[PDB]
Amino acid sequence: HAQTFTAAVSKTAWTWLTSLLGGSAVIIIIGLVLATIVAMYVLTNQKHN
Amino acid sequence: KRQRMVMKLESDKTFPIMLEGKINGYACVVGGKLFRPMHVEGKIDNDVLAALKTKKASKYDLEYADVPQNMRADTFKYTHEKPQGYYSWHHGAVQYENGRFTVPKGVGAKGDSGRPILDNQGRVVAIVLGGVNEGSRTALSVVMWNEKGVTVKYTPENCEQW
Structure with missing residues (x-):
């Protein structure tokens, strides 16, 4: 009856939940990177002149 | 010249x-x-213009609003040709050098924000928003626009809202 903490996993569904938890984190990290890139482009366009 | 500038304004x-x-x-x-x-x-000294809803732009501390075409009939003419030299505005002349506008000391104070800067042809080249004491002169914080349509705000360090 060891019952290791990470033993109630179900491989496939566990990966599905991994995509549900942290996948949105990856999405918002990509969005943050894109927003930073857009801000840097705006600053470059403004300072260009 | 200043007389003609005031008449045009x-x-x-x-x-x-x-x-x-x-x-x-x-x-x-x-x-x-x-x-x-x-x-x-405050509100603009024009009831018809006061009826226009403005939009805010915090970055430049400026607002804008749409004007009816019939009232768009006669507005300021803007130009992008901004060579070095001297220009004219409500309180006299302004020196343009190194990309910055400067006027002699004692010219400009709190309440003058909004006065445009005109060229020899009467075209607007910049809008005065503030300034800072610069000894024998004072440097105005202004916004100008290049031929590519980029809004650039020149603000001296520790500039005061004039």
Whole structure:
């Protein structure tokens, strides 16, 4: 009856939940990177002149 | 020259920002849409123009609004040709050098925000928003636009809202 903490996993569904938890984190990290890139482009366009 | 500049500013519809009977600034219409410095509180001295809803732009502390085409008939003419030299505005001349506008000391103070800068042809080249004491002269914080349409705000370090 060891019952290791990470033993109630179900491989496939566990990966599905991994995509549900942290996948949105990856999405918002990509969005943050894109927003930073857009801000840097705006600053470059403004300072260009 | 200054006489002609004042005549052109008066003939073109320009109206100070009145609050409790005090002139706290000025606003004008250029390119057929009204602009107003956000830091200045009050309403434009024109009931018809006051009816226009403005949008805010915190980055430059400026507001803008759409003007009816029939009132767009006669507005300021903007140009992008800004060579070095001297220009004219309400309180006299302004020196343009190194990309910055400077005027002699004692010219300009709190309440002058919104006065445009005109060239020899009467075209707007910049809008005065503030300034800072610069000894024998004072340097004005202005916004100017290049031929590519980029809004650039020049603000001296520790510039005061004039």
